[PDB]
Amino acid sequence: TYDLLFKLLLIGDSGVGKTCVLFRFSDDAFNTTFISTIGIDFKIKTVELQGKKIKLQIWDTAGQERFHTITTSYYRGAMGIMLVYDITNGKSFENISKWLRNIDEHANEDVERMLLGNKCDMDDKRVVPKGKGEQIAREHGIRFFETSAKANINIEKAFLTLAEDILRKTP
Amino acid sequence: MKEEEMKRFCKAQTIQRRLNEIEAALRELEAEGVKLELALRRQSSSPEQQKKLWVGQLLQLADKKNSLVAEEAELMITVQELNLEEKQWQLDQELRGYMNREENLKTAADRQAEDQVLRKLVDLVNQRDALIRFQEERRLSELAL
Ligand SMILES: Nc1nc2c(ncn2[C@@H]2O[C@H](COP(=O)(O)OP(=O)(O)NP(=O)(O)O)[C@@H](O)[C@H]2O)c(=O)[nH]1
Ligand SMILES: [Mg+2]
Protein backbone atom coordinates (compact mmCIF):
# COMPACT_ATOMS: atom_id res chain seq x y z
CA THR A 1 0.00 0.00 0.00
CA TYR A 2 3.14 2.16 0.06
CA ASP A 3 5.93 2.35 -2.52
CA LEU A 4 9.13 3.08 -0.57
CA LEU A 5 10.34 2.93 3.05
CA PHE A 6 12.72 5.69 4.24
CA LYS A 7 14.57 5.56 7.58
CA LEU A 8 15.17 8.99 9.18
CA LEU A 9 16.94 9.89 12.46
CA LEU A 10 16.88 12.96 14.74
CA ILE A 11 19.96 13.72 16.89
CA GLY A 12 21.12 16.64 19.04
CA ASP A 13 21.43 17.68 22.69
CA SER A 14 18.66 16.95 25.17
CA GLY A 15 16.03 19.69 25.31
CA VAL A 16 16.43 21.13 21.79
CA GLY A 17 12.97 19.93 20.73
CA LYS A 18 13.64 16.75 18.78
CA THR A 19 10.53 14.94 20.03
CA CYS A 20 8.39 18.07 19.58
CA VAL A 21 9.61 18.57 15.99
CA LEU A 22 8.49 15.00 15.26
CA PHE A 23 5.17 15.32 17.08
CA ARG A 24 4.34 18.44 15.03
CA PHE A 25 5.12 16.60 11.77
CA SER A 26 3.17 13.43 12.65
CA ASP A 27 0.17 14.86 14.56
CA ASP A 28 0.03 18.67 13.89
CA ALA A 29 0.03 19.33 17.65
CA PHE A 30 2.40 20.72 20.29
CA ASN A 31 2.84 19.82 23.97
CA THR A 32 4.60 22.22 26.31
CA THR A 33 5.54 19.67 29.01
CA PHE A 34 9.10 18.31 28.82
CA ILE A 35 8.99 14.49 28.80
CA SER A 36 12.57 13.38 28.19
CA THR A 37 13.04 10.56 25.68
CA ILE A 38 14.29 7.32 27.24
CA GLY A 39 16.85 5.53 25.07
CA ILE A 40 15.34 5.49 21.60
CA ASP A 41 11.95 5.56 19.82
CA PHE A 42 10.41 5.82 16.35
CA LYS A 43 7.20 6.95 14.65
CA ILE A 44 5.68 6.21 11.23
CA LYS A 45 4.36 8.86 8.82
CA THR A 46 3.35 8.19 5.20
CA VAL A 47 3.74 11.03 2.69
CA GLU A 48 3.13 11.47 -1.04
CA LEU A 49 6.06 12.77 -3.09
CA GLN A 50 6.17 12.85 -6.90
CA GLY A 51 3.27 10.43 -7.14
CA LYS A 52 4.91 7.97 -4.72
CA LYS A 53 3.57 6.98 -1.30
CA ILE A 54 6.65 7.02 0.93
CA LYS A 55 6.61 5.38 4.35
CA LEU A 56 8.82 7.38 6.73
CA GLN A 57 10.19 5.52 9.77
CA ILE A 58 11.52 8.42 11.85
CA TRP A 59 13.87 7.42 14.66
CA ASP A 60 13.93 9.73 17.68
CA THR A 61 17.01 9.53 19.92
CA ALA A 62 17.54 10.47 23.53
CA GLY A 63 19.84 13.47 23.72
CA GLN A 64 21.05 12.65 27.26
CA GLU A 65 24.60 11.31 27.34
CA ARG A 66 23.79 8.21 29.44
CA PHE A 67 21.89 6.87 26.39
CA HIS A 68 24.75 7.51 23.95
CA THR A 69 25.88 3.95 23.30
CA ILE A 70 22.24 2.94 22.75
CA THR A 71 21.66 5.68 20.18
CA THR A 72 24.86 4.97 18.21
CA SER A 73 23.61 1.55 17.04
CA TYR A 74 20.82 3.25 15.04
CA TYR A 75 23.02 5.56 12.95
CA ARG A 76 24.05 2.92 10.43
CA GLY A 77 20.54 2.21 9.15
CA ALA A 78 19.65 5.88 8.68
CA MET A 79 19.19 7.31 5.18
CA GLY A 80 18.72 10.87 6.43
CA ILE A 81 19.71 12.56 9.69
CA MET A 82 18.35 15.80 11.14
CA LEU A 83 20.86 17.47 13.49
CA VAL A 84 18.89 19.71 15.83
CA TYR A 85 20.01 22.56 18.05
CA ASP A 86 18.10 25.21 19.98
CA ILE A 87 18.51 28.83 18.88
CA THR A 88 18.24 30.00 22.51
CA ASN A 89 20.81 27.48 23.82
CA GLY A 90 24.37 28.41 22.91
CA LYS A 91 25.94 25.10 23.93
CA SER A 92 23.42 23.09 21.87
CA PHE A 93 24.90 24.72 18.75
CA GLU A 94 28.57 24.46 19.74
CA ASN A 95 27.87 20.74 20.16
CA ILE A 96 26.81 20.47 16.47
CA SER A 97 30.50 19.81 15.68
CA LYS A 98 30.45 16.73 17.92
CA TRP A 99 27.16 15.42 16.53
CA LEU A 100 28.62 15.77 13.02
CA ARG A 101 31.61 13.71 14.18
CA ASN A 102 29.29 10.96 15.49
CA ILE A 103 27.70 10.81 12.01
CA ASP A 104 31.16 10.57 10.42
CA GLU A 105 31.90 7.67 12.76
CA HIS A 106 28.71 5.61 12.99
CA ALA A 107 26.63 6.46 9.89
CA ASN A 108 26.70 5.31 6.28
CA GLU A 109 29.10 7.39 4.18
CA ASP A 110 26.35 8.64 1.82
CA VAL A 111 23.81 9.68 4.48
CA GLU A 112 21.81 12.85 3.81
CA ARG A 113 22.43 15.38 6.62
CA MET A 114 20.29 18.40 7.47
CA LEU A 115 20.73 21.07 10.18
CA LEU A 116 17.69 22.42 12.08
CA GLY A 117 17.78 25.43 14.37
CA ASN A 118 14.67 24.81 16.45
CA LYS A 119 12.70 27.18 18.71
CA CYS A 120 12.85 30.00 16.12
CA ASP A 121 9.74 31.49 17.81
CA MET A 122 11.89 32.79 20.70
CA ASP A 123 13.64 35.58 18.81
CA ASP A 124 13.55 37.64 22.02
CA LYS A 125 15.82 35.00 23.61
CA ARG A 126 18.01 34.10 20.61
CA VAL A 127 21.70 33.46 21.30
CA VAL A 128 22.65 31.77 18.01
CA PRO A 129 22.37 34.12 15.00
CA LYS A 130 20.75 32.62 11.91
CA GLY A 131 23.97 33.36 10.01
CA LYS A 132 26.12 31.04 12.14
CA GLY A 133 23.74 28.20 11.33
CA GLU A 134 23.85 29.20 7.65
CA GLN A 135 27.64 29.34 7.69
CA ILE A 136 28.25 25.95 9.31
CA ALA A 137 25.77 24.29 6.91
CA ARG A 138 27.63 25.90 4.01
CA GLU A 139 30.97 24.64 5.37
CA HIS A 140 29.63 21.06 5.33
CA GLY A 141 27.51 21.55 2.21
CA ILE A 142 24.21 20.60 3.83
CA ARG A 143 20.79 22.18 4.07
CA PHE A 144 19.75 24.33 7.03
CA PHE A 145 16.32 25.50 8.24
CA GLU A 146 15.30 27.45 11.35
CA THR A 147 12.26 25.70 12.79
CA SER A 148 9.58 26.03 15.42
CA ALA A 149 7.53 23.09 16.67
CA LYS A 150 5.38 25.48 18.74
CA ALA A 151 4.40 27.82 15.88
CA ASN A 152 4.63 25.18 13.09
CA ILE A 153 7.36 26.96 11.12
CA ASN A 154 9.28 24.96 8.49
CA ILE A 155 8.48 21.57 10.06
CA GLU A 156 6.73 19.97 7.10
CA LYS A 157 9.19 21.66 4.73
CA ALA A 158 12.25 20.23 6.51
CA PHE A 159 11.01 16.64 6.53
CA LEU A 160 9.74 16.66 2.94
CA THR A 161 12.91 18.35 1.65
CA LEU A 162 15.04 15.61 3.26
CA ALA A 163 12.73 12.88 1.90
CA GLU A 164 13.06 14.40 -1.60
CA ASP A 165 16.87 14.29 -1.33
CA ILE A 166 16.74 10.60 -0.44
CA LEU A 167 14.22 9.96 -3.23
CA ARG A 168 16.25 11.89 -5.84
CA LYS A 169 19.13 9.40 -5.44
CA THR A 170 16.90 6.32 -5.10
CA PRO A 171 17.45 4.90 -8.60
CA MET B 1 -0.71 12.68 27.30
CA LYS B 2 -2.42 9.75 28.92
CA GLU B 3 -4.87 10.58 26.17
CA GLU B 4 -2.77 8.14 24.18
CA GLU B 5 -3.39 5.19 26.51
CA MET B 6 -7.16 5.62 26.04
CA LYS B 7 -6.88 6.26 22.31
CA ARG B 8 -4.76 3.12 21.88
CA PHE B 9 -7.31 1.01 23.79
CA CYS B 10 -10.27 2.34 21.76
CA LYS B 11 -8.48 1.79 18.44
CA ALA B 12 -7.76 -1.78 19.57
CA GLN B 13 -11.43 -2.44 20.43
CA THR B 14 -12.49 -0.93 17.10
CA ILE B 15 -10.11 -3.14 15.13
CA GLN B 16 -11.24 -6.26 17.03
CA ARG B 17 -14.86 -5.45 16.12
CA ARG B 18 -13.95 -5.14 12.44
CA LEU B 19 -11.96 -8.40 12.60
CA ASN B 20 -15.03 -10.17 14.00
CA GLU B 21 -17.14 -8.80 11.11
CA ILE B 22 -14.63 -9.93 8.46
CA GLU B 23 -14.43 -13.43 9.95
CA ALA B 24 -18.23 -13.80 9.78
CA ALA B 25 -18.34 -12.41 6.23
CA LEU B 26 -15.65 -14.79 4.96
CA ARG B 27 -17.53 -17.72 6.51
CA GLU B 28 -20.73 -16.70 4.68
CA LEU B 29 -18.82 -16.09 1.44
CA GLU B 30 -17.19 -19.52 1.44
CA ALA B 31 -20.55 -21.25 1.98
CA GLU B 32 -22.16 -19.26 -0.84
CA GLY B 33 -19.20 -20.15 -3.05
CA VAL B 34 -19.49 -23.87 -2.24
CA LYS B 35 -23.21 -23.73 -3.08
CA LEU B 36 -22.79 -22.05 -6.49
CA GLU B 37 -19.95 -24.37 -7.53
CA LEU B 38 -22.14 -27.38 -6.69
CA ALA B 39 -24.92 -25.81 -8.77
CA LEU B 40 -22.66 -25.31 -11.81
CA ARG B 41 -21.42 -28.90 -11.74
CA ARG B 42 -24.69 -30.66 -10.88
CA GLN B 43 -26.68 -28.70 -13.49
CA SER B 44 -24.18 -29.67 -16.21
CA SER B 45 -27.03 -29.07 -18.60
CA SER B 46 -28.99 -25.95 -17.69
CA PRO B 47 -29.30 -22.73 -19.73
CA GLU B 48 -25.98 -21.15 -20.64
CA GLN B 49 -27.48 -17.83 -19.54
CA GLN B 50 -27.98 -19.10 -15.97
CA LYS B 51 -24.55 -20.73 -15.96
CA LYS B 52 -22.79 -17.50 -16.93
CA LEU B 53 -24.83 -15.71 -14.26
CA TRP B 54 -23.46 -18.23 -11.73
CA VAL B 55 -19.86 -17.82 -12.95
CA GLY B 56 -20.45 -14.07 -12.74
CA GLN B 57 -21.59 -14.51 -9.14
CA LEU B 58 -18.51 -16.58 -8.30
CA LEU B 59 -16.27 -13.89 -9.79
CA GLN B 60 -17.85 -11.15 -7.68
CA LEU B 61 -17.49 -13.44 -4.63
CA ALA B 62 -13.83 -13.96 -5.56
CA ASP B 63 -13.09 -10.22 -5.57
CA LYS B 64 -15.00 -9.65 -2.33
CA LYS B 65 -12.96 -12.39 -0.65
CA ASN B 66 -9.64 -10.95 -1.84
CA SER B 67 -10.64 -7.54 -0.52
CA LEU B 68 -11.68 -8.99 2.86
CA VAL B 69 -8.56 -11.17 3.20
CA ALA B 70 -6.24 -8.25 2.38
CA GLU B 71 -8.06 -5.97 4.83
CA GLU B 72 -7.77 -8.70 7.48
CA ALA B 73 -4.02 -9.04 6.87
CA GLU B 74 -3.47 -5.31 7.42
CA LEU B 75 -5.55 -5.27 10.61
CA MET B 76 -3.73 -8.26 12.09
CA ILE B 77 -0.43 -6.39 11.84
CA THR B 78 -2.00 -3.29 13.41
CA VAL B 79 -3.22 -5.39 16.37
CA GLN B 80 0.33 -6.54 17.09
CA GLU B 81 1.66 -2.98 16.70
CA LEU B 82 -0.79 -1.68 19.29
CA ASN B 83 0.04 -4.61 21.56
CA LEU B 84 3.75 -3.74 21.39
CA GLU B 85 3.08 -0.02 21.85
CA GLU B 86 1.12 -0.79 25.01
CA LYS B 87 3.93 -2.94 26.42
CA GLN B 88 6.47 -0.24 25.54
CA TRP B 89 4.32 2.31 27.37
CA GLN B 90 4.24 0.05 30.44
CA LEU B 91 8.03 -0.20 30.67
CA ASP B 92 8.46 3.53 29.97
CA GLN B 93 6.31 4.32 33.03
CA GLU B 94 8.13 1.83 35.25
CA LEU B 95 11.55 3.13 34.17
CA ARG B 96 10.41 6.72 34.62
CA GLY B 97 9.53 5.70 38.18
CA TYR B 98 13.05 4.42 38.87
CA MET B 99 14.68 7.49 37.30
CA ASN B 100 12.71 10.04 39.33
CA ARG B 101 14.06 8.64 42.62
CA GLU B 102 17.09 10.10 44.33
CA GLU B 103 20.26 8.15 43.60
CA ASN B 104 21.35 8.21 47.26
CA LEU B 105 18.31 6.04 48.04
CA LYS B 106 18.86 3.30 45.41
CA THR B 107 20.19 -0.08 46.49
CA ALA B 108 22.36 -2.22 44.24
CA ALA B 109 19.27 -4.31 43.42
CA ASP B 110 17.37 -1.16 42.44
CA ARG B 111 20.07 -0.10 39.99
CA GLN B 112 20.21 -3.56 38.47
CA ALA B 113 16.40 -3.58 38.10
CA GLU B 114 16.51 -0.16 36.41
CA ASP B 115 19.12 -1.44 33.92
CA GLN B 116 17.05 -4.56 33.15
CA VAL B 117 13.94 -2.51 32.43
CA LEU B 118 15.95 -0.24 30.11
CA ARG B 119 17.20 -3.27 28.14
CA LYS B 120 13.64 -4.65 27.86
CA LEU B 121 12.39 -1.27 26.66
CA VAL B 122 15.00 -1.05 23.90
CA ASP B 123 14.20 -4.62 22.85
CA LEU B 124 10.50 -3.73 22.53
CA VAL B 125 11.40 -0.90 20.15
CA ASN B 126 13.45 -3.44 18.20
CA GLN B 127 10.39 -5.74 18.11
CA ARG B 128 8.30 -2.89 16.73
CA ASP B 129 11.04 -2.35 14.15
CA ALA B 130 10.97 -6.04 13.16
CA LEU B 131 7.27 -5.59 12.37
CA ILE B 132 8.16 -2.72 10.03
CA ARG B 133 10.68 -4.98 8.30
CA PHE B 134 8.09 -7.80 8.04
CA GLN B 135 5.79 -5.40 6.16
CA GLU B 136 8.63 -4.29 3.87
CA GLU B 137 9.53 -7.89 2.93
CA ARG B 138 5.87 -8.69 2.23
CA ARG B 139 5.66 -5.60 0.01
CA LEU B 140 8.68 -6.81 -1.97
CA SER B 141 7.14 -10.28 -2.00
CA GLU B 142 3.67 -9.22 -3.19
CA LEU B 143 5.15 -7.30 -6.11
CA ALA B 144 6.66 -10.56 -7.44
CA LEU B 145 3.94 -11.20 -10.08
N1 LIG C 1 9.08 27.74 22.51
C1 LIG C 1 9.33 26.52 22.02
N2 LIG C 1 9.52 25.50 22.85
C2 LIG C 1 9.77 24.34 22.22
C3 LIG C 1 9.84 24.12 20.85
N3 LIG C 1 10.12 22.78 20.60
C4 LIG C 1 10.20 22.24 21.79
N4 LIG C 1 10.01 23.13 22.82
C5 LIG C 1 10.03 22.82 24.26
O1 LIG C 1 11.34 22.44 24.62
C6 LIG C 1 11.30 21.33 25.57
C7 LIG C 1 12.09 20.16 25.02
O2 LIG C 1 11.32 19.48 24.01
P1 LIG C 1 11.67 18.02 23.54
O3 LIG C 1 11.06 17.78 22.22
O4 LIG C 1 11.35 17.01 24.64
O5 LIG C 1 13.24 18.08 23.37
P2 LIG C 1 14.18 16.77 23.09
O6 LIG C 1 15.26 17.11 22.12
O7 LIG C 1 13.40 15.58 22.59
N5 LIG C 1 14.86 16.37 24.55
P3 LIG C 1 15.40 14.76 24.78
O8 LIG C 1 16.57 14.40 23.88
O9 LIG C 1 15.87 14.65 26.21
O10 LIG C 1 14.26 13.74 24.57
C8 LIG C 1 9.83 21.05 25.84
O11 LIG C 1 9.38 21.64 27.06
C9 LIG C 1 9.11 21.66 24.63
O12 LIG C 1 7.81 22.13 24.95
C10 LIG C 1 9.63 25.23 19.96
O13 LIG C 1 9.66 25.22 18.73
N6 LIG C 1 9.39 26.40 20.65
MG1 LIG D 1 12.81 13.72 23.09
XYZ file of C-alpha atoms and ligand atoms in Angstrom:
349
model
C 0.000 0.000 0.000
C 3.138 2.156 0.063
C 5.926 2.349 -2.517
C 9.130 3.080 -0.565
C 10.342 2.934 3.047
C 12.715 5.693 4.239
C 14.568 5.562 7.575
C 15.168 8.987 9.180
C 16.936 9.893 12.456
C 16.883 12.963 14.742
C 19.961 13.720 16.891
C 21.121 16.639 19.037
C 21.431 17.682 22.691
C 18.657 16.947 25.169
C 16.034 19.693 25.313
C 16.428 21.127 21.793
C 12.973 19.933 20.730
C 13.638 16.753 18.780
C 10.528 14.938 20.031
C 8.395 18.070 19.578
C 9.614 18.567 15.993
C 8.488 14.999 15.256
C 5.173 15.323 17.079
C 4.336 18.439 15.031
C 5.115 16.600 11.770
C 3.166 13.430 12.654
C 0.168 14.864 14.559
C 0.035 18.665 13.888
C 0.026 19.333 17.645
C 2.404 20.716 20.288
C 2.843 19.817 23.966
C 4.603 22.216 26.314
C 5.537 19.667 29.006
C 9.098 18.309 28.820
C 8.986 14.491 28.798
C 12.565 13.378 28.191
C 13.041 10.564 25.679
C 14.295 7.319 27.236
C 16.846 5.530 25.072
C 15.337 5.493 21.603
C 11.950 5.563 19.824
C 10.409 5.817 16.350
C 7.196 6.949 14.653
C 5.682 6.208 11.230
C 4.362 8.856 8.818
C 3.354 8.187 5.197
C 3.743 11.030 2.685
C 3.127 11.468 -1.039
C 6.059 12.767 -3.092
C 6.167 12.846 -6.897
C 3.267 10.427 -7.143
C 4.907 7.974 -4.717
C 3.571 6.977 -1.297
C 6.649 7.015 0.926
C 6.606 5.380 4.348
C 8.821 7.379 6.727
C 10.189 5.523 9.766
C 11.517 8.421 11.848
C 13.868 7.415 14.665
C 13.935 9.733 17.684
C 17.008 9.526 19.915
C 17.544 10.473 23.530
C 19.836 13.469 23.721
C 21.046 12.654 27.260
C 24.595 11.307 27.339
C 23.788 8.208 29.439
C 21.893 6.870 26.393
C 24.745 7.505 23.951
C 25.880 3.950 23.297
C 22.240 2.944 22.752
C 21.656 5.680 20.178
C 24.859 4.970 18.209
C 23.607 1.549 17.035
C 20.816 3.247 15.040
C 23.016 5.561 12.948
C 24.053 2.922 10.427
C 20.539 2.206 9.152
C 19.651 5.880 8.675
C 19.192 7.306 5.178
C 18.721 10.865 6.430
C 19.711 12.559 9.692
C 18.353 15.800 11.144
C 20.865 17.468 13.494
C 18.887 19.714 15.831
C 20.014 22.563 18.053
C 18.099 25.208 19.977
C 18.510 28.827 18.881
C 18.240 30.001 22.511
C 20.811 27.479 23.821
C 24.366 28.413 22.907
C 25.940 25.104 23.930
C 23.425 23.094 21.871
C 24.904 24.721 18.747
C 28.568 24.460 19.739
C 27.868 20.739 20.156
C 26.814 20.474 16.472
C 30.495 19.812 15.677
C 30.453 16.732 17.925
C 27.163 15.419 16.526
C 28.616 15.771 13.022
C 31.608 13.706 14.180
C 29.292 10.960 15.490
C 27.705 10.814 12.008
C 31.164 10.574 10.417
C 31.898 7.674 12.756
C 28.709 5.608 12.985
C 26.630 6.457 9.892
C 26.696 5.313 6.276
C 29.102 7.392 4.183
C 26.348 8.641 1.821
C 23.805 9.677 4.478
C 21.809 12.849 3.812
C 22.428 15.375 6.619
C 20.287 18.404 7.466
C 20.729 21.068 10.178
C 17.687 22.421 12.081
C 17.782 25.434 14.372
C 14.666 24.810 16.452
C 12.696 27.185 18.708
C 12.855 29.996 16.116
C 9.745 31.486 17.807
C 11.892 32.786 20.697
C 13.640 35.582 18.813
C 13.552 37.638 22.018
C 15.822 35.004 23.615
C 18.005 34.103 20.605
C 21.703 33.457 21.303
C 22.651 31.769 18.015
C 22.373 34.123 15.000
C 20.751 32.616 11.914
C 23.969 33.363 10.009
C 26.118 31.044 12.139
C 23.745 28.198 11.325
C 23.852 29.202 7.646
C 27.636 29.343 7.691
C 28.253 25.955 9.314
C 25.772 24.292 6.914
C 27.630 25.897 4.007
C 30.972 24.639 5.365
C 29.635 21.057 5.330
C 27.515 21.554 2.208
C 24.210 20.603 3.825
C 20.789 22.179 4.072
C 19.753 24.332 7.032
C 16.318 25.498 8.238
C 15.303 27.447 11.346
C 12.256 25.704 12.789
C 9.575 26.033 15.422
C 7.533 23.089 16.669
C 5.376 25.477 18.736
C 4.400 27.820 15.880
C 4.627 25.184 13.091
C 7.358 26.964 11.117
C 9.278 24.958 8.489
C 8.479 21.569 10.058
C 6.735 19.966 7.095
C 9.189 21.657 4.734
C 12.249 20.227 6.513
C 11.007 16.636 6.527
C 9.744 16.655 2.941
C 12.908 18.346 1.645
C 15.041 15.609 3.257
C 12.731 12.881 1.902
C 13.055 14.404 -1.596
C 16.870 14.289 -1.326
C 16.737 10.601 -0.439
C 14.220 9.965 -3.232
C 16.251 11.889 -5.835
C 19.130 9.404 -5.436
C 16.898 6.318 -5.100
C 17.455 4.896 -8.598
C -0.714 12.682 27.302
C -2.422 9.753 28.922
C -4.874 10.575 26.170
C -2.769 8.136 24.183
C -3.390 5.186 26.510
C -7.156 5.622 26.043
C -6.882 6.260 22.305
C -4.761 3.119 21.876
C -7.311 1.013 23.792
C -10.269 2.340 21.760
C -8.484 1.789 18.444
C -7.763 -1.785 19.568
C -11.428 -2.436 20.427
C -12.495 -0.929 17.099
C -10.114 -3.145 15.134
C -11.245 -6.260 17.027
C -14.859 -5.454 16.121
C -13.950 -5.141 12.436
C -11.963 -8.399 12.602
C -15.028 -10.173 13.998
C -17.141 -8.803 11.107
C -14.629 -9.933 8.464
C -14.428 -13.427 9.951
C -18.225 -13.796 9.781
C -18.341 -12.409 6.230
C -15.654 -14.789 4.964
C -17.528 -17.718 6.508
C -20.731 -16.700 4.676
C -18.824 -16.089 1.440
C -17.191 -19.524 1.443
C -20.552 -21.246 1.977
C -22.163 -19.261 -0.841
C -19.199 -20.154 -3.055
C -19.492 -23.869 -2.245
C -23.211 -23.729 -3.081
C -22.787 -22.054 -6.492
C -19.953 -24.368 -7.533
C -22.143 -27.382 -6.695
C -24.920 -25.809 -8.775
C -22.664 -25.307 -11.809
C -21.415 -28.901 -11.738
C -24.692 -30.656 -10.880
C -26.677 -28.697 -13.491
C -24.181 -29.669 -16.214
C -27.033 -29.068 -18.595
C -28.990 -25.948 -17.688
C -29.297 -22.725 -19.730
C -25.975 -21.154 -20.641
C -27.477 -17.827 -19.540
C -27.981 -19.096 -15.971
C -24.546 -20.731 -15.963
C -22.794 -17.501 -16.935
C -24.829 -15.711 -14.262
C -23.458 -18.233 -11.732
C -19.864 -17.825 -12.945
C -20.453 -14.075 -12.744
C -21.586 -14.514 -9.142
C -18.511 -16.585 -8.295
C -16.268 -13.894 -9.794
C -17.849 -11.151 -7.677
C -17.491 -13.442 -4.632
C -13.825 -13.960 -5.559
C -13.089 -10.223 -5.571
C -15.004 -9.650 -2.326
C -12.963 -12.389 -0.653
C -9.640 -10.952 -1.840
C -10.644 -7.536 -0.516
C -11.681 -8.990 2.860
C -8.562 -11.169 3.197
C -6.245 -8.253 2.375
C -8.060 -5.972 4.825
C -7.774 -8.695 7.484
C -4.024 -9.043 6.871
C -3.473 -5.307 7.417
C -5.554 -5.272 10.610
C -3.726 -8.262 12.095
C -0.429 -6.386 11.838
C -2.002 -3.291 13.407
C -3.223 -5.389 16.365
C 0.327 -6.535 17.086
C 1.659 -2.980 16.696
C -0.788 -1.675 19.290
C 0.044 -4.607 21.557
C 3.751 -3.739 21.394
C 3.081 -0.018 21.846
C 1.116 -0.787 25.009
C 3.928 -2.945 26.422
C 6.465 -0.244 25.540
C 4.323 2.308 27.372
C 4.240 0.052 30.445
C 8.033 -0.204 30.668
C 8.462 3.531 29.966
C 6.307 4.318 33.025
C 8.130 1.830 35.250
C 11.550 3.126 34.174
C 10.413 6.723 34.619
C 9.526 5.696 38.178
C 13.049 4.419 38.871
C 14.682 7.492 37.296
C 12.715 10.042 39.329
C 14.056 8.641 42.622
C 17.093 10.101 44.334
C 20.256 8.146 43.597
C 21.349 8.210 47.264
C 18.309 6.036 48.043
C 18.857 3.305 45.410
C 20.193 -0.085 46.492
C 22.355 -2.222 44.238
C 19.273 -4.315 43.417
C 17.372 -1.157 42.443
C 20.070 -0.100 39.990
C 20.205 -3.564 38.466
C 16.399 -3.580 38.103
C 16.510 -0.163 36.414
C 19.117 -1.437 33.918
C 17.052 -4.557 33.152
C 13.942 -2.514 32.429
C 15.945 -0.243 30.113
C 17.199 -3.273 28.143
C 13.639 -4.654 27.859
C 12.394 -1.270 26.656
C 14.999 -1.054 23.903
C 14.203 -4.617 22.853
C 10.497 -3.726 22.530
C 11.401 -0.901 20.152
C 13.446 -3.440 18.204
C 10.391 -5.738 18.114
C 8.295 -2.887 16.730
C 11.044 -2.351 14.149
C 10.969 -6.044 13.159
C 7.270 -5.588 12.365
C 8.161 -2.717 10.027
C 10.680 -4.976 8.299
C 8.087 -7.797 8.038
C 5.787 -5.402 6.157
C 8.630 -4.295 3.871
C 9.529 -7.885 2.934
C 5.869 -8.685 2.234
C 5.659 -5.597 0.006
C 8.678 -6.808 -1.974
C 7.136 -10.282 -2.003
C 3.666 -9.225 -3.189
C 5.150 -7.301 -6.111
C 6.661 -10.558 -7.439
C 3.937 -11.199 -10.077
N 9.077 27.737 22.506
C 9.334 26.523 22.017
N 9.517 25.502 22.853
C 9.773 24.345 22.221
C 9.842 24.115 20.852
N 10.118 22.783 20.599
C 10.203 22.236 21.791
N 10.011 23.130 22.820
C 10.030 22.825 24.265
O 11.341 22.435 24.625
C 11.303 21.334 25.566
C 12.094 20.162 25.022
O 11.316 19.483 24.012
P 11.670 18.022 23.543
O 11.057 17.779 22.217
O 11.351 17.014 24.641
O 13.243 18.078 23.368
P 14.182 16.768 23.095
O 15.257 17.112 22.119
O 13.403 15.582 22.587
N 14.865 16.367 24.546
P 15.397 14.765 24.780
O 16.568 14.402 23.883
O 15.866 14.645 26.209
O 14.256 13.737 24.574
C 9.825 21.053 25.844
O 9.382 21.643 27.058
C 9.114 21.657 24.628
O 7.811 22.127 24.952
C 9.631 25.232 19.962
O 9.660 25.222 18.733
N 9.385 26.403 20.652
Mg 12.805 13.718 23.091
